[PDB]
Amino acid sequence: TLLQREENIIRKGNIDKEFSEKIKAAGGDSLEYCFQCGTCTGSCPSGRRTPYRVRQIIRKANVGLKDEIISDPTLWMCTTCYSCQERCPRKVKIVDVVKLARNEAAKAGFMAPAHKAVGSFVIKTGHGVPINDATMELRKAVGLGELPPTTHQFPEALEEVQKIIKATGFDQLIGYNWETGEL
Amino acid sequence: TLLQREENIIRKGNIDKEFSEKIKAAGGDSLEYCFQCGTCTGSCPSGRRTPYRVRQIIRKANVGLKDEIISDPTLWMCTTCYSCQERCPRKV
Amino acid sequence: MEIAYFLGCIMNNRYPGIEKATRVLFDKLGIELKDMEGASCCPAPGVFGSFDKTTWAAIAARNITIAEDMGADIMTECNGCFGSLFETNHLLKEDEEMKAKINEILKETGREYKGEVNVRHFAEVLYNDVGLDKLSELVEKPLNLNVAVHYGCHFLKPSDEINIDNPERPTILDEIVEVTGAKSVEYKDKMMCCGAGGGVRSRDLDVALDFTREKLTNMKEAGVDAIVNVCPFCHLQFDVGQMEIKDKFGEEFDIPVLHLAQLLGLAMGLPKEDLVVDAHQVCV
Amino acid sequence: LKPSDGEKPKRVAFIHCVGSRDEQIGKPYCSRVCCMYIMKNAQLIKDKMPDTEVTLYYMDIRAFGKGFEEFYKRSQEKYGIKFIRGRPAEVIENPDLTLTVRSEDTLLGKVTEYDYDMVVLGVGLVPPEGAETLRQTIGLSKSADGFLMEAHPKLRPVDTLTDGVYLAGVAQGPKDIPDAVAQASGAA
Amino acid sequence: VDDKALVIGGGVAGIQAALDLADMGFKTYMVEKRPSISGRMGQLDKTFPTLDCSMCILAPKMVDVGKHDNIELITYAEVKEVDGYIGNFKVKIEKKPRYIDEELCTGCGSCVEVCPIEMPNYFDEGIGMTKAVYIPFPQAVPLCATIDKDYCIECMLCDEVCERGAVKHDQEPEEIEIEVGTIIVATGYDAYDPTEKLEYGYGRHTNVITGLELERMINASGPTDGKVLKPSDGEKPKRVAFIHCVGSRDEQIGKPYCSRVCCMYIMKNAQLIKDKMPDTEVTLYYMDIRAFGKGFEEFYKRSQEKYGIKFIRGRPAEVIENPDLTLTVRSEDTLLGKVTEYDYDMVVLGVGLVPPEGAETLRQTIGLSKSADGFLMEAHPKLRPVDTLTDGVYLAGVAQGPKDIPDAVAQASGAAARAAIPMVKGE
Ligand SMILES: Cc1cc2nc3c(=O)[nH]c(=O)nc-3n(C[C@H](O)[C@H](O)[C@H](O)COP(=O)(O)OP(=O)(O)OC[C@H]3O[C@@H](n4cnc5c(N)ncnc54)[C@H](O)[C@@H]3O)c2cc1C
Ligand code: SF4
Ligand code: SF4
Ligand code: SF4
Ligand code: SF4
Ligand code: SF4
Ligand code: SF4
Ligand code: SF4
Ligand code: SF4
Numbered sequence A: 001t002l003l004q005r006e007e008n009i010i011r012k013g014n015i016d017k018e019f020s021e022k023i024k025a026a027g028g029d030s031l032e033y034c035f036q037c038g039t040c041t042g043s044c045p046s047g048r049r050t051p052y053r054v055r056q057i058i059r060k061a062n063v064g065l066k067d068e069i070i071s072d073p074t075l076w077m078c079t080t081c082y083s084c085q086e087r088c089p090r091k092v093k094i095v096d097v098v099k100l101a102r103n104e105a106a107k108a109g110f111m112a113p114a115h116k117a118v119g120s121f122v123i124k125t126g127h128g129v130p131i132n133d134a135t136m137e138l139r140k141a142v143g144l145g146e147l148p149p150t151t152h153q154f155p156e157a158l159e160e161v162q163k164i165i166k167a168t169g170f171d172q173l174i175g176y177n178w179e180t181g182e183l
Numbered sequence B: 001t002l003l004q005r006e007e008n009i010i011r012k013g014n015i016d017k018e019f020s021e022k023i024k025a026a027g028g029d030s031l032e033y034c035f036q037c038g039t040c041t042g043s044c045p046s047g048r049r050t051p052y053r054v055r056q057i058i059r060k061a062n063v064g065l066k067d068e069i070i071s072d073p074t075l076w077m078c079t080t081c082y083s084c085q086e087r088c089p090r091k092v
Numbered sequence C: 001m002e003i004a005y006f007l008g009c010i011m012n013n014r015y016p017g018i019e020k021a022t023r024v025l026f027d028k029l030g031i032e033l034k035d036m037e038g039a040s041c042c043p044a045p046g047v048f049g050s051f052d053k054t055t056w057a058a059i060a061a062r063n064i065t066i067a068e069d070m071g072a073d074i075m076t077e078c079n080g081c082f083g084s085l086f087e088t089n090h091l092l093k094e095d096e097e098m099k100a101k102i103n104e105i106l107k108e109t110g111r112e113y114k115g116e117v118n119v120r121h122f123a124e125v126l127y128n129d130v131g132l133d134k135l136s137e138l139v140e141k142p143l144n145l146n147v148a149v150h151y152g153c154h155f156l157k158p159s160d161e162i163n164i165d166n167p168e169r170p171t172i173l174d175e176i177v178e179v180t181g182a183k184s185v186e187y188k189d190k191m192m193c194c195g196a197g198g199g200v201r202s203r204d205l206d207v208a209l210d211f212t213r214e215k216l217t218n219m220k221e222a223g224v225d226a227i228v229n230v231c232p233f234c235h236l237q238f239d240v241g242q243m244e245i246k247d248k249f250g251e252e253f254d255i256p257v258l259h260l261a262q263l264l265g266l267a268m269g270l271p272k273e274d275l276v277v278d279a280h281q282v283c284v
Numbered sequence D: 001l002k003p004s005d006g007e008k009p010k011r012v013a014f015i016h017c018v019g020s021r022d023e024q025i026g027k028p029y030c031s032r033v034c035c036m037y038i039m040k041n042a043q044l045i046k047d048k049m050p051d052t053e054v055t056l057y058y059m060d061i062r063a064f065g066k067g068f069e070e071f072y073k074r075s076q077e078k079y080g081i082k083f084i085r086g087r088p089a090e091v092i093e094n095p096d097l098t099l100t101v102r103s104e105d106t107l108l109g110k111v112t113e114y115d116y117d118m119v120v121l122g123v124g125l126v127p128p129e130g131a132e133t134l135r136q137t138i139g140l141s142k143s144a145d146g147f148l149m150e151a152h153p154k155l156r157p158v159d160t161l162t163d164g165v166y167l168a169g170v171a172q173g174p175k176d177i178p179d180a181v182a183q184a185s186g187a188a
Numbered sequence E: 001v002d003d004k005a006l007v008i009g010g011g012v013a014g015i016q017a018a019l020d021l022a023d024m025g026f027k028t029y030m031v032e033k034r035p036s037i038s039g040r041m042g043q044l045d046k047t048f049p050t051l052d053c054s055m056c057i058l059a060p061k062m063v064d065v066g067k068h069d070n071i072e073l074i075t076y077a078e079v080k081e082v083d084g085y086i087g088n089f090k091v092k093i094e095k096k097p098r099y100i101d102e103e104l105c106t107g108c109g110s111c112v113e114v115c116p117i118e119m120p121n122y123f124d125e126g127i128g129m130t131k132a133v134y135i136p137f138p139q140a141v142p143l144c145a146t147i148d149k150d151y152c153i154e155c156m157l158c159d160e161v162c163e164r165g166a167v168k169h170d171q172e173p174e175e176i177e178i179e180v181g182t183i184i185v186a187t188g189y190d191a192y193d194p195t196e197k198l199e200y201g202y203g204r205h206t207n208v209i210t211g212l213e214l215e216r217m218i219n220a221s222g223p224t225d226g227k228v229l230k231p232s233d234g235e236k237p238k239r240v241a242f243i244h245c246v247g248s249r250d251e252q253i254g255k256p257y258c259s260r261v262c263c264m265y266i267m268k269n270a271q272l273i274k275d276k277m278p279d280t281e282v283t284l285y286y287m288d289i290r291a292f293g294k295g296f297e298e299f300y301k302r303s304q305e306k307y308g309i310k311f312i313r314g315r316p317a318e319v320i321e322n323p324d325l326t327l328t329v330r331s332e333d334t335l336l337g338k339v340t341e342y343d344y345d346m347v348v349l350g351v352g353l354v355p356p357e358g359a360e361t362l363r364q365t366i367g368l369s370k371s372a373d374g375f376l377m378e379a380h381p382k383l384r385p386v387d388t389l390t391d392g393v394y395l396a397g398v399a400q401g402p403k404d405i406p407d408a409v410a411q412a413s414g415a416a417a418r419a420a421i422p423m424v425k426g427e
Helices: A017-033 A039-043 A054-063 A066-070 A073-077 A083-087 A094-107 A113-125 A133-141 A155-168 B017-033 B039-043 B054-063 B066-070 B073-077 B083-087 C010-014 C016-028 C045-051 C053-070 C079-093 C096-107 C122-130 C132-137 C172-178 C197-203 C205-221 C232-249 C260-267 D034-048 D068-077 D131-138 D177-187 E012-023 E054-066 E110-114 E157-161 E211-218 E262-276 E296-305 E359-366 E405-425
Strands: C002-005 C032-035 C074-076 C119-121 C146-150 C226-229 C257-259 D011-018 D053-058 D082-085 D090-093 D099-105 D110-116 D118-123 E004-008 E027-031 E071-074 E077-085 E088-095 E118-120 E129-131 E174-180 E182-185 E208-210 E239-246 E281-286 E310-313 E318-321 E327-333 E338-344 E346-351 E393-395
Touching: A017 A054, A017 A094, A017 D068, A039 A054, A039 A083, A039 E327, A054 A066, A054 A094, A066 A094, A073 A094, A073 C197, A083 A094, A094 C045, A094 C053, A113 A155, A113 C045, A113 C197, A133 C010, A133 C016, A155 C053, A155 C096, B017 B054, B017 E296, B039 B054, B039 B083, B039 D099, B054 B066, C002 C053, C010 C016, C010 C232, C016 C032, C016 C257, C016 C260, C045 C053, C045 C079, C045 C197, C053 C074, C053 C079, C053 C096, C074 C079, C074 C122, C079 C096, C079 C119, C079 C232, C119 C122, C122 C132, C122 C172, C122 C260, C132 C172, C146 C172, C172 C260, C197 C205, C205 C232, C226 C232, C226 C260, C232 C257, C257 C260, D011 D034, D011 D099, D011 D110, D034 D053, D034 D068, D034 D118, D082 D099, D099 D118, D177 E405, E004 E012, E004 E174, E004 E405, E012 E027, E012 E054, E012 E071, E012 E182, E012 E405, E027 E077, E054 E071, E077 E359, E088 E182, E110 E157, E182 E359, E182 E405, E208 E211, E211 E262, E211 E346, E239 E262, E239 E327, E239 E338, E262 E281, E262 E296, E262 E346, E310 E327, E327 E346, E393 E405
Parallel strands: C002 C032, C002 C074, C074 C119, C146 C226, C226 C257, D011 D053, D011 D118, D053 D082, E004 E027, E004 E182, E027 E071, E182 E393, E208 E346, E239 E281, E239 E346, E281 E310
Antiparallel strands: D090 D099, D099 D110, E077 E088, E088 E174, E118 E129, E318 E327, E327 E338
16 A cells, blocks of 8 residues: 555644754754755755655754664765755855765764774774775885884874763774673 | 666656657646746645655656656546636636 | 874874874974864754754863863864864854853863864865975875865855855865876766765765766776775765765776875885775775 | 734744745745844844844845855844745744744755744835725836836836826836936936 | 937937937937947847837837937047036046948948958857948938957958948047036946856857847847757757746855846747747746736737647756757656756847946946945836936946836836936026
């Protein structure tokens, strides 16, 4: 059956005005004066190959459809290419709104395992893409040091990075467990 | 994966002008002059409990998206209650 | 001239040839590259900025304080790292409350963000501080190459803040490429994203590979011999994603991917082993 | 204040194009000022009662005049007025006397039923009562919209085909105050 | 108070103001920077919403201006200095050298036929050619020839072929000094130049044109003899796209205002293309359809119903030139909620209205203030639309802001009345 009594109508029960106020107060206030021209969607390269519609994301953020936004997988189709923001005739900070919505979604638990893996790599080694043995050998062969002069080479720098991560609660956000060093 | 190379873009390959001309010649002439106000969809009782959107059907008929229309299950959600037609400001 | 040298992750950990070519090129230009001891992920904006702005800003601010300690501007040759560091810098400089919060977080690390240095891009430093004439003087092997220039999204955008070149139709990278003798070939959707930014590569590999496949189809129709980029994240996308595209759809492009530093090294007669072509998955 | 209780409304809806651009009532013309005065009254309600929520239901926003587009943008940026592109299908009175506007959000592509304490209809402009009597008394013709007809649409906007008789202001058709004043001076 | 008036600008607004002042009995000067009067109205083929011929109705007024006893017409001239105050304005004008004697030239056109040098015609808006010696259009007032010395080579063939002895290669600029009591500024507008909109590709793509260029092309007396032809190959386009709000309602270029007429003339030109070429497909990309004027909503409905013109609600993201020089418009259909990439043989940009070239110089010369949109500002936005805070100076037409012909005509008549009141009082 095509019947579904909740997905095809919008009432006040679907609206969270506090979400919109939070987004605007956090640096996405420009979304207030979007007049829905559709330039952003036409400029969006991901919108051409996925169900992602940035204009509808902006509209939902203005209306206050929190649950519809944060739980939406298409929210993660934006590459932050800024093509929409360069062309918006109302100068809306579209990418800022997208990132704020992604922050809210992550707070709600809509984080992909791969992104959490990247975060865990940063926690453990300070690098989102840590070096592997083959690259170590390549570095040695070409006259560079076996390790780059980064957190890879300085444990105290890694400790500082871990202190920063603990202070911001990022480890709790991705569910990193220090005791076992896993997610 | 959310990737879908054909469903998320409209080109001339998705358009069948002969379908639009056939519908207009068979008595759907008025659809040419929809201004997409959305009164029909707001009036539709099946529009608020199913994915059926009458305004989008009118728009697709004008554009010529034959395959998107004829294969659409929601096309069969209309009860022919005539509320939309009664309230259309363009008399479609 | 002295400048702090930020490496990032992908360049130093997957493609050291870019780093070696950059070091040699800057030694030839009389610019002292100072290592940023203890630097970490910038962090990659796609994941961290999408997850928590505070953590991203704090890590970027620590990276910036590393250079502030030396009293030197930061130089980056990654569009992602440049975007992250530059955005954090101009967010903390122009926002006192956010600066106070980030400094409160940084306190326990024995660091404080002062907003005393600038974040600069590798291509911008080459164009302004060196100039096309001195870059040209150093060319010893004028190249014969048709190259597709991939600007990357975060080199020039958001242009309101970066103000380096026109994002729609820029010419800075084309000029820097052409002083080497190679020809920058126009192709359809040249300013298109590679698909790796915003964390899309790790979230939905198919979508990013579709971005890359569209770009590669356009580049191949124009006839290019190689792809030139100023972003190791775009470099990795193109290189590894050509192999992934071949594995998934059996489509062959065989278009070598070069960083701008590698192209300059080739035009300047650097030793071949210094380019570390063995790192690249696509044979050059 | 609400007509029902003497209390300030917390939620106000405005409906555009009431009595205009509608062939169901034989009013196929634009009234040319309802968009702007709707936005103006929304801004005034926000000024007097900042906590009030105001939503406008529109088909087109015709902010064509001088400073009108800036006024339109200011309605959103400064006062936080909400714009829904949709011609409302119905207004339903609830038992508690609040009003549910049932309308499609065409840019979301979905039906919405939103509750409001007050609904304001953006009524259009029509010829005044007794217009036909005076028109026959003078001997003037009328245009398709019911207003008086000018001698030439382009080059004689204030003249009529009856020599010595001239038109000024909304007598010749809907328009705002500066246009009517210019027409009055030209007629003089 | 002097009983003489100066009207600056020879467009429909200026023509109406000058004729109204002259009929009321006041001696009037008219100053026009172009060789002939008419303004932009003379360049149009038809006018909305009636699709009536623009020149057929404008030319009689131009002739009336040219032969009025109370009007002194000074074309190809510019106001250089304005001093004094209301009733007591001293104005110094410079009449540029035509190198043709206005009193002797009959506008026969033999010199044009014989001239060997080709140069662009300003009346054709960059798509039509004429000779170094030219008459801007057949209905020009005064019907007199003009030599542009940037292109003249001094071959003297025009001198040989001229039977009236009207050619004057030794002519010099002339200084005129007039005393007036009131001034009406009717300097009109220029079309927005969309070259800076790099994504739409004007000036780069071959088959991308503006609305005014389309007006000249569709005009039966235009450079193409009234045929809409692709610039690339000179053949009729089978698919035409129109883009609204080019140069308007766009903060990326600092143009946050509506140009107030582009919707209507876009629809008018689409209807004219359909009338001439019924098999052509015409599509309009719009944000709002602003059919506000009398008969405008009916004109819009007629565009959809009678002509079958397609309307897509969406501001196009980009215009891409294909190898065969066809143009792909990439734009969201916001009502379908989906991205579309449609192909067309020609793309017409609905460019907006901007203040004319040299507007700032004249504004400073007179001493007037300008509004936020860049046009001249009136004394009161509601009750004094044609007055300025400078006593004795009035505004008429698009000089005060974008608007259509009837609005400009009403403003010109009102300005004539407002300027006549002080001259009637006399003190
Ligand atoms: C493509 C297009 C189509 C249009 N179609 C229609 C239509 O169908 N119907 C309609 O009603 N309106 C239409 N309009 C609008 C219409 O053109 C204007 O309303 C009208 O032309 C305004 O007349 P004007 O005299 O105020 O200005 P203009 O027509 O611009 O005339 C101004 C005059 O002043 C002169 N001038 C400028 N600067 C100086 C100076 N410093 N010194 C002396 N003289 C100077 C100019 O050269 C010109 O002679 C259209 C506009 C465009 C761009
Ligand atoms: S381009 Fe700007 S104004 Fe247009 S829909 Fe997108 S965010 Fe809104
Ligand atoms: S930044 Fe995101 S929403 Fe904007 S154009 Fe790029 S992918 Fe689309
Ligand atoms: S009510 Fe009529 S004009 Fe409005 S969307 Fe429906 S069919 Fe179109
Ligand atoms: S006839 Fe009834 S069910 Fe069918 S579209 Fe119209 S309102 Fe909906
Ligand atoms: S001015 Fe606006 S509200 Fe009034 S009739 Fe026209 S479109 Fe409708
Ligand atoms: S200058 Fe002489 S030849 Fe030329 S148009 Fe005038 S009268 Fe004729
Ligand atoms: S003298 Fe000048 S205007 Fe006359 S024919 Fe020669 S080039 Fe032409
Ligand atoms: S009149 Fe229409 S096309 Fe012109 S600027 Fe206004 S909305 Fe855009």
